[PDB]
Structure formats: C-alpha cells, structure tokens
Amino acid sequence: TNAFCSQFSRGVYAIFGFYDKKSVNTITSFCGTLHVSFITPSFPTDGTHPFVIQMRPDLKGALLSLIEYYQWDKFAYLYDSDRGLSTLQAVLDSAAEKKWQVTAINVGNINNDKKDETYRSLFQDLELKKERRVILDCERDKVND
Amino acid sequence: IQIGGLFPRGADQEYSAFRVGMVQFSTSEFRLTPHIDNLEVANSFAVTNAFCSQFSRGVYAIFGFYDKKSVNTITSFCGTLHVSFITPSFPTDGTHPFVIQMRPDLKGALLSLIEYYQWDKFAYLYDSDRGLSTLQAVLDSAAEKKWQVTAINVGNINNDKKDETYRSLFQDLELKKERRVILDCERDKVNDIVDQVITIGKHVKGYHYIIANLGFTDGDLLKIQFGGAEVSGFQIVDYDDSLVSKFIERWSTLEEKEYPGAHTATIKYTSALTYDAVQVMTEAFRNLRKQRIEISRRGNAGDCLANPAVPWGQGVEIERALKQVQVEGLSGNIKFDQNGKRINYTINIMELKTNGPRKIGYWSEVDKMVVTLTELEQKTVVVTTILESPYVMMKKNHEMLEGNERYEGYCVDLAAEIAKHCGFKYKLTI
Amino acid sequence: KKWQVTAINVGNINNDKKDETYRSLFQDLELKKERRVILDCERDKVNDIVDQVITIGKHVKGYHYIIANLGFTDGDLLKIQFGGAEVSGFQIVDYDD
Numbered sequence: 001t002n003a004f005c006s007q008f009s010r011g012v013y014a015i016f017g018f019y020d021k022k023s024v025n026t027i028t029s030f031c032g033t034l035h036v037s038f039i040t041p042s043f044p045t046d047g048t049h050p051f052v053i054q055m056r057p058d059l060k061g062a063l064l065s066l067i068e069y070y071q072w073d074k075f076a077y078l079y080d081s082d083r084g085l086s087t088l089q090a091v092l093d094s095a096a097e098k099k100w101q102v103t104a105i106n107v108g109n110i111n112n113d114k115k116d117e118t119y120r121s122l123f124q125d126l127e128l129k130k131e132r133r134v135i136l137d138c139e140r141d142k143v144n145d
Numbered sequence: 146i147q148i149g150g151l152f153p154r155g156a157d158q159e160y161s162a163f164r165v166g167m168v169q170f171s172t173s174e175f176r177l178t179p180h181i182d183n184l185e186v187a188n189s190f191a192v193t194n195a196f197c198s199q200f201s202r203g204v205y206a207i208f209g210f211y212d213k214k215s216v217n218t219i220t221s222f223c224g225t226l227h228v229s230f231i232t233p234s235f236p237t238d239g240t241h242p243f244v245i246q247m248r249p250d251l252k253g254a255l256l257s258l259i260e261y262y263q264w265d266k267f268a269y270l271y272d273s274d275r276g277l278s279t280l281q282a283v284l285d286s287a288a289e290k291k292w293q294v295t296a297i298n299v300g301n302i303n304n305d306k307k308d309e310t311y312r313s314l315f316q317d318l319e320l321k322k323e324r325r326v327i328l329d330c331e332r333d334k335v336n337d338i339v340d341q342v343i344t345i346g347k348h349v350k351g352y353h354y355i356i357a358n359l360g361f362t363d364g365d366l367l368k369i370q371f372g373g374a375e376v377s378g379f380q381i382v383d384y385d386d387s388l389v390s391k392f393i394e395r396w397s398t399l400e401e402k403e404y405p406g407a408h409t410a411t412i413k414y415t416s417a418l419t420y421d422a423v424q425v426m427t428e429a430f431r432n433l434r435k436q437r438i439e440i441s442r443r444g445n446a447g448d449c450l451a452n453p454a455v456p457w458g459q460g461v462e463i464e465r466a467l468k469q470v471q472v473e474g475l476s477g478n479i480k481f482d483q484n485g486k487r488i489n490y491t492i493n494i495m496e497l498k499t500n501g502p503r504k505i506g507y508w509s510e511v512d513k514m515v516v517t518l519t520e521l522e523q524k525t526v527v528v529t530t531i532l533e534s535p536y537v538m539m540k541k542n543h544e545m546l547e548g549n550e551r552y553e554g555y556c557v558d559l560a561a562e563i564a565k566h567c568g569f570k571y572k573l574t575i
Numbered sequence: 576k577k578w579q580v581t582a583i584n585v586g587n588i589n590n591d592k593k594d595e596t597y598r599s600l601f602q603d604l605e606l607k608k609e610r611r612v613i614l615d616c617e618r619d620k621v622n623d624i625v626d627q628v629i630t631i632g633k634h635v636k637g638y639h640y641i642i643a644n645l646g647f648t649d650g651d652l653l654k655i656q657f658g659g660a661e662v663s664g665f666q667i668v669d670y671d672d
C-alpha cells in the first residue's frame with residue numbers, strides 16, 4: 001500500500017510488479033479505483049478485474065487436458081494456498097463431473113520446527129489409498145522439498 | 146474513549162444489536178462514543194480509507210466487518226499500527242495479532258458431526274465467495290477418515306449438459322436410500338440452493354441436509370421442513386439461558402422504525418456477536434481502568450501512510466486487556482486465547498423434527514461431540530400367527546436378529562404381500 | 576352424475592397434531608383404494624397436504640390430484656413435480672400475456 005501510494009504521488013504512468021495472494025486484492029482494487037495500469041509476472045487474478053495486465057498464461061486448461069490425456073481417474077493433488085485456490089476449484093469441479101477420485105491435501109501450512117512429523121502424516125495420508133499418481137502444484141522451493 | 150464504526154451498508158439487525166449493546170452496557174465511568182461508518186465491505190479501497198479515517202480521528206479500538214477480499218488489508222494494517230480490531234466476521238486461518246474474532250471455529254463441530262452421523266460418502270456444496278476453509282478442513286480429514294466427498298461449487302450448477310451430467314452425480318450418493326449433503330453458504334442463499342438442488346437432481350426424497358453455520362434457527366425452515374428430508378445444523382445462541390430469553394423479550398418489545406428490524410422471536414448470530422463485542426469492549430476498558438493503566442493517547446495518531454509508521458505502545462496493553470476478558474454472553478461462555486480465537490465456546494447440535502427445532506446435544510473443544518438425547522409409530526396393524534412349518538418358522542440365527550426379520554415362511558411372505566397391497570405397516574406376533 | 580364422493584373436513588386440525596391426522600386420513604383413503612383426490616384449499620393448506628403426500632409416498636404414479644384454487648402456480652409444485660402423479664389445477668393468471 002505504501003509503495004503503491006508512493007508511486008502514485010511520484011506520478012508514474014504505469015506500475016510493474018509482483019503480488020502474493022494476500023496483496024492481490026489491494027493491488028487490483030487500488031489500480032481499479034485510481035486507474036493506474038499494473039503489469040505483472042504473477043499468477044492471473046481470479047476475476048474480471050480491470051486495469052491489471054497479467055503476463056502469465058493460465059495453466060488450468062493445459063493441466064486438465066494433460067490429466068485427461070494420461071487417462072487418470074484417480075490421483076493425489078498437492079497444493080499451496082500461496083497462488084490462490086482457483087486451480088483447486090477447477091480440478092475439484094471437474095473431479096465431480098468426470099467421476100474422478102481426488103485426494104487434495106493442503107501442504108501450504110507447514111512447520112519448519114517439525115518437518116518430519118508433517119511429512120510423515122502427509123505421506124501416510126496418501127498411502128491409505130496407495131496413490132501412485134501425484135500432481136504437485138506449488139511454489140518452486142516447496143516443489144524441491 | 147472513541148471506537149471504530151466500520152459497517153456494511155446492508156447490516157441492520159447487527160447495527161440494532163450494536164446500539165442496544167451501547168444502551169445496555171452504558172456506564173457513567175466512561176463514554177464509548179461510537180463513530181459509525183457505512184461503507185462497501187468487499188472493496189479494499191473503501192476499507193483502507195475507513196480504517197485510515199478512524200486512525201485520523203484517533204480511535205483506541207476498531208469494530209468492523211471484513212469480506213474475504215478485504216481481510217488481509219485489515220490484518221496487515223492492524224498488525225503494523227498495533228490497533229485492536231474486534232469482529233463477528235469469519236475467523237482468519239493461522240495466527241494473527243491485534244484481531245479479536247467473536248465467532249467460534251465451525252470446523253471441529255462439523256467434523257465431529259459428520260463423524261457422529263457416520264457418513265462414509267457425501268456431497269459438499271460450497272460458494273467461492275464465502276471461502277473454502279471449511280472445505281479444506283473436511284478434505285484434509287477426508288483422506289484419513291476414508292471419506293468419499295463430491296465437492297460441488299454452487300456458483301455454476303447451471304448447465305454442464307443441463308440436468309444430465311449433474312443428476313448422475315447428485316443421485317450417485319444415494320446409499321441407505323438416503324442422499325447426504327452439507328450446505329455451508331448463508332441462510333437465504335441456502336434456501337435457494339436446496340431448491341435448485343431439488344430442481345437439477347429431479348429426486349425429491351431421502352435427503353439428509355447439514356447446514357454449516359452458527360445460524361440454524363436464525364431463518365425460516367418451513368420450506369425445507371418437509372421434503373421427507375432430515376435436517377441438521379448448529380446453533381451458537383441458546384434460548385434456554387436466562388440472559389438470552391430476557392434479551393429476546395426486550396428485543397421483541399422494541400419499535401420497528403427506530404431500530405431497523407429490531408423485533409423478532411429470534412436474533413441473527415452475527416448481531417448477537419456484535420452485542421457480545423460491545424460487552425467485551427466495555428469489560429476491557431473497565432479492566433484497563435481498574436488496573437490503573439493509562440491508555441489515553443497524548444498526541445494525534447497522524448496519517449497511516451506516514452513512513453516509518455508509528456504504533457502506540459499502550460496499544461499492546463489494550464490488546465492484552467481485550468484478550469484477558471472473559472464474560473457470559475449470547476454466544477455462551479466468552480473467553481479468548483493469545484491468538485484472538487474463541488475458546489471454551491459451546492456449539493449446539495440441532496435436528497429439525499415434526500414439532501420443530503430441538504437440541505440433541507453440544508460440542509466443545511475438550512468435550513468434542515456430546516449427545517443430550519434423553520428423548521412410537523402412529524399406526525401399526527398387529528398380525529397374529531402360530532409357529533408351524535412351513536407357515537411361520539424361526540430363522541437359523543434369530544438371536545442377533547430383531548423385529549419381524551426373524552420370521553420366515555409362506556405366511557410371512559404372504560403377510561408382506563397383503564400389507565404391500567393394502568399399504569399398511571405391520572408387526573408379526575406369536 | 577351418479578358420483579361417489581367421500582367428503583373429508585381437513586379444516587379443523589391442531590398444528591401440534593400436524594402430520595399424524597394426515598397420515599390417518601391418507602391411510603384410510605388407501606384402504607378404500609381412492610386414487611383420485613380434490614384438495615379444495617388455499618395455497619398454505621395445499622402446501623401442507625402436498626408435503627404430507629410426498630412424505631407418505633403417495634405422490635407416485637397412479638394418483639391423480641386436482642388442486643382447486645385460482646392459485647395453482649402460487650403453491651410449491653416443484654417437490655411433487657417429479658413424483659409421476661398427475662396434478663391438475665386452475666390458473667387465472669397467465670404469464671403468456
């Protein structure tokens with residue numbers, strides 16, 4: 001908010017930036033209200049929001065197409081809340097429609113104090129249904145983890 | 146002592162509960178002098194301007210509402226400026242400072258309820274506007290609890306090959322010849338939802354509905370009352386309590402024009418949370434007075450945009466006071482943790498019956514699910530017969546069998562046919 | 576017209592009694608094998624009776640109901656719509672106009 005207000009006071013015509021799912025609503029609302037154009041590499045906002053230009057293409061269609069290509073009726077979906085729940089809603093609705101059995105576990109909230117406990121609980125949660133197919137939707141560090 | 150007045154334009158009964166809270170809890174020791182602001186809650190900009198306005202006026206604490214879009218602004222700003230925020234609105238996930246959340250967590254109660262009804266497979270409807278938190282909870286628990294959950298977004302049920310695709314889904318879940326559905330949207334919208342469910346599903350019979358809200362008795366259940374469908378829910382306001390009954394009488398006595406929607410047999414749970422919020426703030430300021438801590442601000446608060454931002458030290462003390470407050474209220478026992486979440490709260494489990502809504506028990510953090518129970522067909526045609534082969538005979542193991550299911554023979558099947566044609570329920574007796 | 580008519584007064588019933596009297600009534604209609612029914616009621620009572628019918632399961636095929644009021648579309652027919660039982664009535668207000 002302070003950075004955006006600073007840039008507004010400076011009188012810049014356009015603003016380039018990145019945003020977390022926490023600061024996205026503020027950015028879109030402020031750009032919509034003050035008519036300042038925003039260009040971003042970040043995940044596309046979920047909605048019709050004006051004045052915001054998102055350089056990143058949407059992965060949902062590609063993802064669902066790939067799942068449908070590999071012919072998976074059952075898989076594990078691991079996700080973090082950092083980039084938003086849109087894709088989750090998509091794969092869940094489509095899971096309902098195509099009769100997919102999907103296990104969606106939020107890995108977004110995790111403790112570095114105890115990593116081992118949480119990971120053990122996660123994998124033991126997956127091992128009940130013996131999932132051999134997993135979709136990792138995560139920030140890159142978490143993907144590496 | 147000035148406080149923040151953030152309110153949605155469509156909030157009336159909660160506004161009335163706020164004013165009633167001000168009048169009832171009014172004391173000669175100190176004046177709360179509430180400054181009311183009407184704004185659009187979904188807009189982040191308007192919330193920012195309202196909060197910065199309240200900060201400009203230099204209010205000590207702030208009361209308001211926040212939509213899932215406006216939440217992070219409030220949490221961040223109150224987090225940086227060390228200002229206390231008290232709200233009836235949905236509890237934030239994770240730990241946040243300076244925010245006091247009046248409504249109890251619904252997750253545990255819902256999980257315990259599903260586990261109590263022993264549902265293996267069910268459908269969960271959700272609206273993307275309210276948020277997926279509870280859905281995320283039940284999905285996280287779904288893996289361990291062996292639950293098969295069909296998650297339907299109420300947002301678009303409209304086409305998808307019209308009825309044909311979604312009907313298979315909706316009537317797939319029939320198990321006991323009973324279909325199981327959890328709603329969790331909002332009261333009015335929930336009525337619309339169940340109606341739409343009956344439309345798209347084409348099957349009107351055998352539904353067990355679970356409304357997930359603290360507002361079970363806060364709306365009219367007459368339309369969903371008889372489909373032949375079971376209805377269960379959660380009630381945060383117990384009318385058996387003396388305080389609540391008295392408050393209900395006085396609430397019902399009030400005039401309609403002065404306070405909007407002021408008199409009704411029931412009260413919106415959010416409104417009751419606003420009232421409870423007024424009481425909690427009163428107790429907090431009183432406790433700040435009794436402990437001789439000076440919370441009065443010397444200078445003007447200034448501009449919220451100012452960098453680096455200047456927090457007030459005594460604000461910490463204010464927060465401490467708000468967290469130390471424990472009182473009795475419409476929501477039951479009111480106590481707070483270090484994170485601001487409600488604790489010791491008691492959420493009533495309700496089932497809708499022929500004579501109307503009743504309480505089957507209560508849920509607590511430590512006690513989990515507790516059934517109250519404590520408690521007859523209308524007409525039963527008595528069929529007499531003697532045990533003889535092969536007319537009426539006892540099944541091989543009738544000891545673990547109960548009722549008429551332990552009698553087999555020509556006369557049994559014959560009785561079943563007769564009673565099927567004449568359409569009466571019967572009991573076989575020797 | 577040589578009609579055989581069984582006329583029942585549903586008018587006076589206690590709200591506490593509710594479903595029970597209706598159950599008795601419709602069971603007594605089932606034992607007489609009466610598959611044809613005329614409601615003759617305002618939308619409220621029509622809704623109550625229809626709810627009862629759907630609960631006891633008499634809204635299935637083979638039952639013919641005639642709702643006599645000018646309010647045929649005013650009550651809730653959505654719930655008895657998929658039962659398969661033929662429901663006829665009177666509408667004085669046409670949305671086609």
Ligand SMILES: *[C@@H]1O[C@H](CO)[C@@H](O)[C@H](O)[C@H]1NC(C)=O
Pocket residue numbers: 477478489491
């Ligand atoms: C609140 O919690 C305390 C914990 O010791 C308990 O003793 C008390 O009965 C609770 N109050 C209510 C109203 O449940």
